[PDB]
Structure 1
Amino acid sequence: TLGALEFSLLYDQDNSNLQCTIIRAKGLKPMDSNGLADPYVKLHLLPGASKSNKLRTKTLRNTRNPVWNETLQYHGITEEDMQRKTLRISVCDEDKFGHNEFIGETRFSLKKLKANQRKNFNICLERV
């Protein structure tokens, strides 16, 4: 009962561009009483060199059913990266002082993506 995440991936191979559309989440679990329902998504390429491997959506306010409707683009993604790397997608709530609480995540091996073929996802978040 952590919550369900919706997203779409496309690897525009010829332009070395992996386009990650973070669509929405539904039923994000209420947690820290002192925290806020200010959800946002973080992307990580694993293994990665930190900083540059990370992308982040807009933070919404007062919602457990956020609609981000946003495409995060990893430019300079190669066949070697698609072979090696895993896309970790993590949902978190931003708190009163710009810190956060981790709600849940999902992971997808980029080997399974096919060049120029959009894959849509509707998954439930998990904790590892």
Structure 2
Amino acid sequence: KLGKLQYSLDYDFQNNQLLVGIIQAAELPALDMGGTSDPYVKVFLLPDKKKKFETKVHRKTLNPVFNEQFTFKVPYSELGGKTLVMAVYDFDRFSKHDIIGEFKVPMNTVDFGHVTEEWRDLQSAEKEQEKLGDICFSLR
């Protein structure tokens, strides 16, 4: 309900690197005072959360246009089992930056060869039990 996100995806086989472009976003819900939020998008490889990339902060727009580009130096063999995460955050100067949305893209569903660029609907990020342990015994 927050809005949609237009992004670009393609792989450069000449340098063996992933080219992820953040085009823009639309119809984002407002969380700030003026009637518009201050959005910025954090993008990182889904498999390992290392070297996350963040875009510049846009002031008071529910339709931010970033038109930015990020490069993930990852071989083509490892790429297949690697996912992409694009999460939209709301900037706040005096508090925690609340997450507006998130989107995950499996690299086995992605087809490289033609330059991909699409709009995808944003969804609410996941917050389960912490322990995840089990004990087995018998009663008689």
Q: TM-score range by the shorter chain?
A: 0.7 to 0.9
- Runs of 4 or more, structure 1, over 6 Å off, are none
Give 1:122's aligned residue: 119
Give 1:82's aligned residue: 79
**1:51 Cα deviation from its structure 2 partner:** 3.6
Give 2:97's aligned residue: 100
Give TM-score, length-normalised by structure 1: 0.85
Greater Cα radius of gyration, structure 1 or 2 = 2
For residue 72 of structure 1, the aligned residue among 70, 80, 84 is 70
Higher strand share: 1
**1:14 Cα deviation from its structure 2 partner:** 2.5
What RMSD over aligned residues (CA atoms) do the two structures have, in Å?
Answer: 2.0
1:30–1:108 Cα change, 3 Å: same
The structure, 1 or 2, with the larger RCO (C-alpha pairs under 8 Å, 6+ apart) is: 1
**1:72 Cα deviation from its structure 2 partner:** 1.4
Contact residue 11 and residue 117 of structure 1 kept, 8 A:
no
Matches within 5 A, 1:8-87: 8-31=8-31, 37-48=37-48, 50-52=49-51, 54-74=52-72, 76-87=73-84
Higher helix share: 1
State how many pairs are aligned: 124
Structure 2 residues not aligned, in runs of 5+: 127-140
Structure 1 residues not aligned, in runs of 5+: none
**1:38 Cα deviation from its structure 2 partner:** 1.2
Give TM-score, length-normalised by structure 2: 0.79
For residue 110 of structure 1, the aligned residue among 86, 103, 107 is 107
